[PDB]
Each structure stands twice: as C-alpha cells, then as structure tokens.
Design a protein around this nucleic acid. Structure first.
Lengths: 251, 173, 130, 204, 193, 106
RNA sequence: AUAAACAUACUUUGAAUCGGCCAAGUCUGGUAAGCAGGACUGGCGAUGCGGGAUGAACCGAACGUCGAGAUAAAGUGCCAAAAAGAAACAUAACGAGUACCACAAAAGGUAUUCAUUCAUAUUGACAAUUAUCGAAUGAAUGAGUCCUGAAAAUGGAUGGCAUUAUAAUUUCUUAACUGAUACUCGACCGUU
RNA sequence: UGUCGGCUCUUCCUAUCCAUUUCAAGCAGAAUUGAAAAAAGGUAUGAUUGUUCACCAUUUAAUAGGGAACGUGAGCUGGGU
RNA sequence: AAUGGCUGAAAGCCUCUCAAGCCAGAAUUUCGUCUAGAUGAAUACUUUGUCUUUUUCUUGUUACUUUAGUACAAUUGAAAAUUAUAUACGUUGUAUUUAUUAUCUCGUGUAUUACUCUAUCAAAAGGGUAGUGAAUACUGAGUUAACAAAAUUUAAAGCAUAA
C-alpha cells in the first residue's frame, strides 16, 4: 500500500556512508581548472580557525531595501601565518589519472617538516633528509636534480608546491607542521617549474594567494559528536508519548 | 531433387485397363516420386494403389547440363489466406537445378514449406521473356560488374588458422 | 574506377576444390552469385561448370572476342591466340603458383642445404652494408 | 613445452564479441593474451542504440545496497574483460586461471608496443558486417557513458605513430641497402655453386 | 529492388578544378575553395570524360558509381551528385539568401557587426533579451535595405543553416502564431551572380 | 638438442553437456586444422611430461611421464582421441603434450 | 494369414488397494480458470537415465557390474563435446532466436520483397521547364517481413556472454560431426 | 504465517496533479482544452466518523492515482472487530 | 528526448531522413563539482643486490645469524592508415609454443649488429658518441663420441646487533 501522505526524505544520500575521517587536515579533492593564458600563481593556502565574531557592514548593492546604517553579519576569523615552501612535485596525465613523476625538495628542511615522517619523535634518530642535506651539493646529486627538473618540463602537466606551516607562530600545542600541496595554475609547464624553483625555501603569505573581496572555497572537518540517534543524525519525527520501548527511533 | 518418369494403369470395374497415366515428378528419391504420383491419381481420378499397377519409374537426366537456360515454373501454393498461382523465373543449367531454387526461394520470401507447393509445369522461356526485375539485368550479352569486398579465399580447411599474424585485408578481387 | 570485372571472357583462377590453382575462362553469367567457367578442358582441364564467385578470383587478362555461351572448340582457339598461359606465368600469382609446386617436392636433404645456404648469404649480405 | 610467450592482439577494426569468443576459448588452452587498443573495437549499433543498451545495463543494481550491486565499468578495457569473462567458466579454478592471462590497455604500453601483433579473421569487421551497417567504437561509446581518459589515449597514440613512422623509414632504408647488397653477391661468380642450388628450388 | 549499376555524373565547367582522394572531394574555382567528405562505404567517386549531350562532344565529368545495392542505398548516388554540383555552383556563382523582417507593432533593429561574422536582433516583440546568432565560417551577413538582410557564402549547407538559425531564434512562444506573424523569414534563395 | 615432437594441448576428456569420461583425452595437435590431416597421427606416441619438485633425500625422479597413443579423430577440426596408461590429471588441462614421430610408418 | 510348450487350463490360500493426478488433431457446466465432471489410450503415482537452462507427467528411452563401438531425442560462435558451404525475406530495434512454455489482438502505414490483373507504354507516357525534356509510368488486389498499436509496481533474464550480407530466421548440399543406464559385440555376478 | 485502521519510515510503478521542453484548438490577449518527451524534485492544515470511504471549511504552483504478505503489532496504539 | 528546421534523394517535381549527412532544442544524460573508496604512484629514512623453505626472536616488521644447495654478459617480438582501399600487383596455400650444421682446438685481418659491458651527453628513448668483448660472413683445417651420466626450479636450524 502507498504511504498516505508524502514528505521529503530525511537526510541526504549524497553523503552516505557517514564514515568519520582519520586525519584532522582535509585534502581538497580538486583545484580550479587551469588556464594557460595567465602568470603562474598559487591556488590555495591553509589556516587555523580561531573563532567567530560579528561586524556591522555598509551595503554597497543597489536596488536593495537593506538599511543604510549597516547590516549585522557573522564572520569567522582564520589565522594564517606565512607558509614555508619545501619542495615541489610534477604530475603526469596517464590512463589511471594523475601519477606523480618526481618530487624535488629543498636543501634545508625545518624540524617541523621532519616530524611528519615519524610517529614517536622523542625516540627517533631524527635523521630525516639527513642524507639529502649532507650530499645536496655533490656533483652526483646536483646532476640528478637537474635531471628531475628536466623530466618534469618534458613529461608532466601538473605542478604542486609542497608547503608547510610553522607551528611556532600559533597557540596550538602541536609542533609537527601541516603539509599541503598547492597547485600552480598559470602559464606553460616550462615557467611553472621556473616559478616553482624560485619558491624553494621561501615564505609565502596569504595576500599573495588571495585578493580583496574574493569568493573562495573552504574544506575542513566538522565538529565531532560521537554516537548519535536517528533524531539528531537524520532529523526524523519523534514518536508519540504513549509508545512502548522508547520515542526516539524510526518505527 | 531428381526428376522421374512414372507410369501406371488402373485395373478395376470403373477404369478401362488401356489408358496409362504418365507424369514427370521432381522428388528427392524414387519412393517420394511414387508417393506424389499416387496422390495425383487418387485426387484426380479416384484411382487407388490397391487397384492399380505401376509400370515404369525411371530417372530423367538433363540432356545438356552445360547450357544456361531461363526457366518458368508455374506453381500453386497455400497461404494463411487462401490458394494462389505464381509464375517465377529461374536461370540454371538443369531442370532439377532450377526446382531446388524455387523450393528454397518460396520457403524464404513466402515462408512456405515444401508441403504447400504443387509444381504445375516448368518450361524454358526466351531471353526477353524474363520479367523478374533482378534476373532481367543479367540476361543481356554485355553484363559486367566488379565483385568488391571480396573475402580472401582459403584453398582448404588445412590452412584455416584461428589466429593469424599481421593485418587483414579484403580484395577488390 | 575498378580494374577487374566479372564479364564474359574474363580469365579467372580457381582457388578451391579439385581444380585449385588452375586457370578458367568465364563464358556466361547466370546471376550475381554464379558464373559458368569453361577454362578449356583441352588445355587446363577445367570442365564446363557453374561455380560460385566465392571460390574463384579474377585476373588481369580478358580473352578477345568471347561471346556468351561460346563453344569449347572456338573458345580454345581464342585462348591460345591470346597466349594466356604464357602471359599468366610472368605475373606475381603465376610465379607464386609455380613456387608452391617447387616447394612441395622438396626432401629433408633438400631443405637442409637451402636453410644452410640462405643463412650464409643473408648474413653475408648484411655484412656488406656499412 | 611451456608457452611463455604472449599473443598480442591489435583490437583495431575488430568486433567486440567475436574477438572475445576466440580469445576466451584459447585462454582455456594455456595461451596468454594481451589485447592492445581495446578502445578501437566495433559493436553493431549507432551511438543512440548503444546508449539505450547501456542505460538498460546501468539499471541492474542491488536495491537494498548498491555497493554490492552490479559494477558497471565504463572503461573500454573493462568492457572487453567483462565480455570475455562471460565466455569463461564461472566459479571454478579453471575459469579464474584462464582469466589471469588476459589484459587490455587502451593504447600500447611500453612492452607491448614493439611486439609482433596478431589478428583474428573470424572477428574482423570487414568479414562479418554489411558495409552500410552503422557501428560504434568502444572509445566513442565509453566517452558518452563517463570514461574520462579518452583524450589521454588519443594523445599517447598520436606520439606512438610519430615514433613508429620514423623508425619504419629508417628500417626501410637499411632493408633496401641489404636487399641490393644481396643481389650483387647473388650474381657474383664465386657464389654460383651455392646459387645454382637455390635456383633449383626457386628460392633465388 | 537491387540495381546492378546506378550511375550519376556532374559536369565540371572550365574554371573549376576537382581533385578526389578516397571520397574526399576538394573543389577550387574562381571564388574560392570548398571541401567535403562523403563517408558512404558503398560509393565510388572518380573523374573521367563522358559524352553527356545527344550530339554534343565529350566533357570533363565526375562519375558517382554504385554497383549492386538496395534502393535504400541506391538513393545516395544522386544525393552525393547533387552535393558536388552545389559545390561547383558555390565556388563559381556563390549562393545568397535574402531574409526579410516582419513585425506587427514593435520595430526590430538588426545590429550587424563590422566584420559581418555576427548579427544582433533587438526589440523583437518588445522583448528586452537580445539575440546574437553566430554565423558559420564563410558566411557573411549584410543589410541589403530597410528591414532586409542577405547572407553571402559559398557552401549552400553553411549559408542555408545560418539563415535558418536566425529565424529559429525569433519564434513566437505561447501565442497564436497565426496572428503574431513576427520574425525573420527567407524571402528567396538565389545566386550572387 | 633437437625438436622431435609436436606440441598438443590437453583440452579435456571425452564428455557431454553434463557428463565426463576420463578414459579418453582430447588433444589439439599444432598445425592440424582439419580431420583429413589426422590419418598421419593415428597411432603415434603421445607423452605428458611433467615436473615434480622432489626433496633432496627422495629417490623418486624429478621428471615423470605418462605415455599413450592417438587412437581416432574427434570432429572436423583436427581434434584427436588419446588413451593413456593412466588418465591424465585434470590439473593438466591446457598444458602441452609431446606428440612423437613413432611408431613410424614412413 | 500371423504368432504361441518355461504354451495352455487352472485350483487353493492370502496380502495390499478402491483420496488419485496429468496429456490430448475429445466432450459437457461455466465469461474463464493451474476450475468441476466424463468416453478411449498412454503416463505420473511406483521411475531413475540423455534432451528441453531449471520442472511428477513433455521428447528419446525404461536401469545387474563393466570395456569398446555405432546411434535416439536434440544439437555443432564461448560457457559446452560437436560443421563447412549455398540462396534469400529480416536486422538502425531490449527486432529475431530450442515445441508443451510461461503471452499479445483488432486496426493503420507513399515502409520493404515478390506475384496476378488493367491502362499509358514512341517516334515520343509520366515529372519538370504545343515544343524540349527521352524509358519506363500509373492503378487495383493479394502473399511474406518491418513499424505503430504495446502502460505496473526490488534490479534481471532468447539460460548467460555475445551476434547483426549473423553466431537470427525459412529452406537446402556434403558416405560431416557430437551423444543416453536404450542397441551390437565381449568379460563377469545372479534368476529361469 | 498475530487478523482493520491510524501514526512513523524507505523504496518502487506511470495510466502525470504542479514545475521544465514541445505540437494542436472553434488558440486575438488572459484563462482554458487535447496530446508528446520526462518519474530527477514536490504533492498540505482541520470539524464529524474506529472507519478505508465520504462530505464540508481553508491554504497552495499542485494539494495525482497506486504497489511492496490488501508494506510496516519481539515498531507503537487497541479506537473497531 | 519529444519537437521545429538545413541540404537532399528515392520518385527529373516534393519531402526534416520507415535514406546517407547536419543544426536548434528539457526540472534530461555525461563531463566539471561534492562524499566514501580498491589496485596504486612519488618522496624521506633503514636496508639489500641470484634465489627459497623449515625453524626461530619480537607487541610486531625489516635487516640480521648458522648449515647447505643453486645460476653466473653477450643472435628474443613494432610501419601506420584504408578496405567502393590514387594507378599497377593481388604478390597465392599453416599464428604462438616451434626456424642456429654435435663438442672442443687451431687459426688472419676486415666488416656487421634493435647484442653485452665500461665512460660520457642525454633520456619517463628497442638514443647519440668512444672503447671493449660475443656471435656471424669472408672460410679452412684438425680431435672426440660407442657402455654409464647428463636438472635447477630449495631445503634445514637461530636472535648478537641496528632501524
């Protein structure tokens, strides 16, 4: 028999299954579509949410009935200290999606970036990138790096810079940095690698990436709530008071 | 298909025993030829096998199975609706050769099985008497056409390999 | 424009059956599927018969002044006058037909020398090129 | 003996089902097959007709749990594997072993781009099709149903033709030189003893 | 039924050069160059000479030949022959399509770009949306007179389609079209020369 | 040293749709594409030679064989019937079988 | 005429059983029913085996334990043992595809193939522009195939994969082939 | 095999009520009527009755018709039977 | 998609096509975007460089330890496209497994190679250069074989140290 009355289904199936993530940082599953008729630039950043406040702002839109003295809006504050670029990677377009080809790294690597390659740092030998650094200037290694740069310019289509935060500038207790791959959208692959190489060991600020009054996307992990029932998970109707064995369930 | 010459006579009160029934029957073998022959007698002269004597049942062979001839088969067949008479022309070198064409063509275009067709007669017509739209195009003396999209021929099943080497080509032939 | 046609007088080449790799001459066309080959039985041995076009192949020769339903006697005169056998044996198929007959009578000793001799010649010819 | 070689099949200008029947029979006979260019196969039907069949195919899906449901692979190399797998024994060791000896790639990867290629005369589209019957390439159909890598394969194939074109021209020059050097020493006076044997059997 | 041989031809005038490479006819004439592909797997297109008049002499022709084939496929010989015939006209005396504008109460303004590769239709039936309508390569619009434009080009398939594209953008919707006889219509189809 | 045999594929036993008779094994000799090329091989020796990874201390051979004879054709595509001393192991389907040249009648 | 001596005629004592069901070139009641009830026969029950994918009844054929050989129904692109050739009307479609069987009708089409009848067919019919234009044109009917008609509830069923001048359908040719616990020959076990 | 209805909830059918795209009208406009594609999204609040059903008063772009063991009792209620 | 059109035959005309070839057209389909996600890839450090099993230490993994056994660089595998395919020819008629004249010695230089190795420039190459070796052709000559034997593909025991 058909349902007597109709109503929209509770919850969205665009997010089923509701599996919780493992890493606090969330990776963007995409980047803005590349345009090859512009100067290379960075298309992403990474900040730490501080809190929320409210501002009174003056309406500049025309043909609107909003008050002339200002509208109250909520705003989130995202503290974004400068990032450190510690390498770059080239990607190639194959018949199984992007496949990274090489990852050229800088000569000097901060201890924040080294902590990402271990689990018990206080027991580690902390020899990450030690062989890379000690032999950086050798002709055997310098020749290999020039091959890696030339390989990307010949057989790659996507360049991303491996940039990491500096946890000393934030009130968090975590010391290990957060690493994010930021794509370079711009001219030919020849000058993308040229632009990428110039950024090694340099610091990038959020103003170089985003402009003024710019619309952006935000990717993050929502606040956790643990185990929950169907009324909070899916917003279904609570059962009448008379019900045996409980009210807050799908009948 | 083979052609037979069958004769018989009826020896009873109703029929005088001095009139011989002849026929030219196209049958796969001489047992079927007699079976067709007896039915034509019973359905047309009330002559039954138990009151008749067969005289001759001889095969008939083509005199010149090397001369191309245009045939004209007059026949009647039974459909879902009723019974019709058809006249179909065929090109072949033997009388039996053309009849097998008629049986195979009727069973394809008209979906009519062999036990619905009675061959009334078969004659040989002239070159200009052919009226089949397709068959009329090949009766002239100056017929000529290139056979395109030829599949390459294999001498025998001996060289029929499942997987070959290289590429495959048709033939302008 | 197509070069080889299925006409009257066209010299065809049987490709299967008991008369495979034997020449024949079309003297009649029954329809789009069947032709009457009479490759002179007094010359090549192909009897006057009707064959399907899937079993034969065309050639580059047409016998001059062949009418449909030509008799065997007059057809033989036009076949030798054109000298089809002389002309056919100089073609790529003609030499391929005689090659197959040459190879099918080899013995194990015959195949031994050829494999040995040709291997040296091919190796030596490769050396001579800088 | 043990046949460790691979029978490379160039799926260009073939029929999808007819290729599979010949391959799926010979996978059960111990042969290892690699079908390069499984995106150049042909299937009977216009693009409109092929999409209706795909729309019917996509409907088959477990109602209570689509994650368990029939998995509809859009890549042409997976259309061929599915078609081949339907002609192999199901749920036994014999069927699974024969499937492990089959691979397509949409183009021609590094090892199989320089191997000798084969053909299946039963599956050729020039022997089993009316020329006026409209057909559909697997790659063209795959793009319609959501196969994204139709442009990578077209780019990769383009550079494989430019590399082979110059290799073929270089090989042609060397072959002409060797061919003309063989004629000179076939006609030499010292080699008459050997040549006389070759002329006897028609080799030379 | 199946025809053993269906043949059609198109005569080439003096100023037209035709070269054929695997059903790919390229026609070059006094006005320009035209190209097309006839991907029918059962036609044979080739140049030759053939006497086409009862008492006239030989002349250069392009012969479209199709052998044994059903009437579904035998009908394409004359279709391709007509297509090649239109090419010869197009590169010798190009095609022009005169389109006239009809309105009831609201005048309609056509803003033709400077290059002639685009047009603009405004105030159609008092609407505020403006229709652009691109033009195919080789087709040029121009304002002939008052409430009239003509399209100039060589390919009759490009010219006619562009004219129909202009009409198709200015249809009356949700109204009795037997009363609202508005839009741009093709007055007549003729040759530039 | 030399090749004195022709490889044949152990396709499977003589069978029906739902039955199987392992007394007779079907083989596909290489180069025999029709049943008229079968009369040569009717009677020739056939061997299924396999390899066993024996332990060091075991005196059993590391290469064992099962022999048999080709007895009759099977179908029009040059498939033969072979009967062995012991029925072939069904794990050996699709493997290669040496078809020798003796008993020679040449 | 044919067959019949482990033929024929029995006598005595007794068991179980009398809920039946199915098929059909059959019938009666009923709108009909996998409904109810009958005449004749064959089956299932009491019965496995090969085939129809699967199935109490359909098709072949009825069973001691086996070896080899021809066969039956029916099959021969792969699952699956086994086929090659010939001609056609089909096929731009979830159209076609192993009877019982698991569905489709009336009706319509300037869709297509073939046949019959009639008229125009030339020194000139039809279409287009009396002339040119120069070979078929028009009408009616019948028989096959195709398309519309053709809408149901979990996602799915020519058995599946697949085919498309077929690997579909209708008919053929070839002293082609495959295959049952039935047939022939042989060995052994038991009854007579 | 827990036998009505209601409540809660998901999914499915189209023989479509609305929204989208089209053709026709005895379609001037507005409002309507007949039909095609299309089932991805929506399709209400109450008085009386245990009612399914019904009949009223509104609101809405619309307040369409049905299936899932006449969906759903170790999901509820027990109004009816 | 429905639908409206373009060129256009069949059927000299007409026709959007129960023809080939195109365009416009949906809350439509597919890319793009979002969520979960298998086989994977790159980089960092620790190793190892012909190979395995049974044991064994550890929370566990890798390297590691002992006793053996096993192989030792050098002829493999690519035209593309079309098929009514420019003209000519039809090059016929057996895909992989599976195309080397038994072993060794003596010999002279030259030449060759999708051959091996070294150095170098490059390179996600059957790459270039230079050298060396191997095999082959010019192209030989000589020794030996009789009975026997001509086989790996992997077994068995450990926890000192490091990550």
């Amino acid at each position: 028999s058909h349902r007597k009355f109709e109503a929209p289904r509770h919850g969205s199936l665009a997010f089923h299954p509701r599996k919780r993530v493992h890493k606090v940082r969330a990776t963007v599953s995409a980047f803005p579509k590349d345009n090859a008729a512009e100067k290379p630039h960075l298309t992403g950043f990474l900040g730490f949410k501080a809190g929320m406040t409210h501002v009174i702002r003056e309406v500049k839109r025309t043909n609107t009935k909003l008050p002339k003295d200002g509208v109250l809006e909520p705003v989130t504050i995202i503290e974004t200290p400068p990032m450190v670029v510690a390498g770059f990677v080239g990607y190639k377009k194959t018949t199984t999606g992007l496949k990274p080809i090489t990852a050229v790294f800088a000569e000097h690597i901060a201890d924040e970036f080294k902590r990402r390659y271990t689990k018990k740092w206080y027991k580690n030998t902390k020899n990450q990138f030690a062989v890379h650094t000690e032999k950086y200037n050798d002709v055997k290694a310098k020749s290999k790096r020039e091959r890696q740069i030339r390989l990307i310019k010949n057989r790659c289509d996507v360049v991303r810079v491996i940039a990491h935060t500096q946890m000393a500038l934030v009130p968090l207790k975590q010391k290990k940095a957060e690493v994010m791959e930021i794509q370079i959208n711009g001219g030919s692959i020849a000058e993308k690698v040229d632009f990428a190489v110039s950024l090694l060991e340099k610091q990038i600020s959020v103003n170089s990436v985003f402009g003024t009054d710019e619309c952006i996307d935000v990717c993050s992990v929502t606040k956790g709530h643990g185990y929950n029932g169907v009324i909070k998970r899916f917003g279904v109707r609570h059962l009448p008071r008379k019900t045996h064995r409980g009210l807050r369930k799908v009948a | 298909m083979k052609e037979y010459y069958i004769t018989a006579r009826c020896t009873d009160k109703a029929h005088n025993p001095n009139e011989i029934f002849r026929s030219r029957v196209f049958a796969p073998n001489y047992v079927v030829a007699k079976s067709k022959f007896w039915m034509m007698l019973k359905k047309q002269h009330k002559v039954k096998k138990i009151n008749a004597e067969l005289l001759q049942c001889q095969p008939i062979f083509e005199k010149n199975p090397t001369v191309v001839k245009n045939y004209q088969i007059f026949l009647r067949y039974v459909s879902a609706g009723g019974i019709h008479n058809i006249t179909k022309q065929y090109r072949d070198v033997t009388r039996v050769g053309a009849v097998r064409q008629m049986y195979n063509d009727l069973a394809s275009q008209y979906r009519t099985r062999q036990d619905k067709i009675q061959l009334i007669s078969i004659t040989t017509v002239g070159d200009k008497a052919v009226k089949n739209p397709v068959l009329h195009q090949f009766v002239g003396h100056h017929v000529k056409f290139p056979m395109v999209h030829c599949k390459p021929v294999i001498a025998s099943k001996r060289f029929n390999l499942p997987i070959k080497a290289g590429k495959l080509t048709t033939k302008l032939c | 424009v197509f070069s080889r046609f299925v006409e009257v007088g066209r010299v065809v080449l049987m490709k299967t059956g008991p008369f495979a790799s034997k020449l024949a001459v079309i003297v009649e066309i029954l329809d789009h599927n069947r032709v009457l080959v009479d490759g002179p039985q007094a010359i090549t041995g192909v009897p006057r018969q009707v064959v399907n076009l899937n079993t034969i192949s065309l050639t580059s020769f047409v016998v001059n002044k062949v009418t449909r339903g030509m008799t065997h006697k007059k057809l033989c005169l036009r076949f030798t006058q054109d000298a089809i056998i002389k002309r056919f044996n100089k073609t790529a198929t003609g030499k391929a037909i005689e090659k197959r007959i040459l190879r099918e009578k080899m013995t194990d000793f015959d195949k031994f020398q050829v494999s040995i001799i040709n291997r040296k010649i091919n190796a030596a010819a490769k050396i001579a090129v800088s | 003996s043990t046949n460790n070689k691979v029978t490379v099949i160039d799926c260009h200008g073939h029929v999808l089902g007819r290729v599979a029947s010949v391959v799926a029979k010979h996978l059960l006979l111990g042969q290892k097959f690699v079908l390069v260019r499984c995106e150049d196969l042909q299937v009977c039907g216009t693009l409109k007709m092929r999409l209706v069949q795909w729309e019917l195919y996509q409907r088959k899906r477990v109602n209570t749990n689509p994650t368990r449901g029939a998995f509809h692979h859009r890549s042409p190399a997976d259309m061929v594997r599915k078609a081949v797998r339907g002609m192999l024994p199901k749920n036994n060791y014999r069927g699974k072993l024969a499937l492990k000896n089959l691979k397509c790639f949409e183009g021609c990867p590094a090892p199989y781009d320089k191997m000798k290629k084969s053909s299946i005369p039963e599956a050729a589209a020039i022997y089993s099709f009316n020329p006026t019957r409209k057909r559909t390439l697997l790659g063209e159909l795959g793009t319609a149903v959501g196969w994204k890598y139709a442009d990578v394969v077209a780019k990769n194939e383009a550079e494989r033709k430019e590399r082979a074109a110059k290799w073929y021209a270089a090989k042609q020059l060397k072959q002409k030189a060797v061919a003309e050097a063989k004629e000179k020493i076939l006609a030499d006076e010292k080699y008459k003893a050997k040549v006389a044997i070759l002329k006897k059997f028609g080799y030379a | 039924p199946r025809l053993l041989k269906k043949t059609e031809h198109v005569v080439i005038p003096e100023g037209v050069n035709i070269e054929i490479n695997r059903k790919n006819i390229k026609v070059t004439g006094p006005r320009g160059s035209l190209t097309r592909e006839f991907q029918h797997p059962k036609v044979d297109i080739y140049a030759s000479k053939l006497v086409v008049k009862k008492e006239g002499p030989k002349e250069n022709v392009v012969v479209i030949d199709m052998w044994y084939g059903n009437r579904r496929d035998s009908a394409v010989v004359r279709t391709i022959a007509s297509h090649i015939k239109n090419m010869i006209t197009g590169v010798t005396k190009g095609y022009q399509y005169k389109m006239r504008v009809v309105y009831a109460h609201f005048p309609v303004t056509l803003v033709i770009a400077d290059d002639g590769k685009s047009i603009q239709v405004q105030n159609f039936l008092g609407e505020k949306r403006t229709r652009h309508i691109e033009m195919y390569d080789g087709v040029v619009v121009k304002k002939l007179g008052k409430d009239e434009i003509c399209l100039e080009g060589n390919d009759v398939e490009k010219v006619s389609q562009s004219a129909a594209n202009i009409h198709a953008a200015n249809l009356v919707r949700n109204k009795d079209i037997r009363q609202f006889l508005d839009g741009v219509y093709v007055s007549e189809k003729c040759l530039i020369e | 040293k030399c090749r004195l045999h022709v490889n044949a594929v152990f396709m499977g036993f003589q069978r029906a749709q739902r039955n199987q008779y392992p007394n007779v094994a079907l083989l596909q000799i290489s180069g025999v594409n029709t049943k008229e090329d079968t009369p040569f091989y009717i009677g020739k020796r056939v061997a299924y030679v396999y390899k066993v990874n024996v332990k060091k201390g075991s005196n059993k051979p590391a290469i064992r064989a099962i022999f048999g004879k080709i007895v009759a054709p099977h179908g029009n595509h040059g498939v033969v019937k072979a009967r062995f001393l012991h029925n072939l192991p069904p794990k050996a389907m699709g493997q290669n079988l040496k078809v020798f040249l003796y008993p020679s009648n040449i």
